[PDB]
Amino acid sequence: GSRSFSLGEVSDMAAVEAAELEMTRQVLHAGARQDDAEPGVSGASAHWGQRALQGAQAVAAAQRLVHAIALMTQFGRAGS
């Protein structure tokens, strides 16, 4: 008996429709988790990185050495 809907209700409803449509974008960009997002794509050969790793290899001899004493110090050279 209302003679259908009022056009003002439709006007407000259209604002909600527009809002939901944009809200949908926000929730989609908030979707997914990095739990299954391991990287894989690669296409560049490390150049300067190799020189850094060559250093890492040379120093590793000193590192495995310092670590050896670090064990003796936490063991307090005990055992007997």
UniProtKB/Swiss-Prot annotation:
It is found in: Secreted. Signal peptide: none annotated. Released in a processed form. It comes from the Bacteria. In the N-terminal section; belongs to the adenylyl cyclase class-2 family. Bifunctional adenylate cyclase toxin-hemolysin that plays a crucial role in host colonization. It causes whooping cough by acting on mammalian cells by elevating cAMP-concentration and thus disrupts normal cell function. The Gly-rich region is probably involved in binding calcium, which is required for target cell-binding or cytolytic activity. This is Bifunctional hemolysin/adenylate cyclase. It comes from Bordetella pertussis (strain ATCC 9797 / DSM 5571 / CCUG 30873 / LMG 14455 / NCTC 10739 / 18323). The lineage of its organism: Bacteria, Pseudomonadati, Pseudomonadota, Betaproteobacteria, Burkholderiales. The gene is cya. The chain holds residues 411 to 490 of 1706 of the full protein.
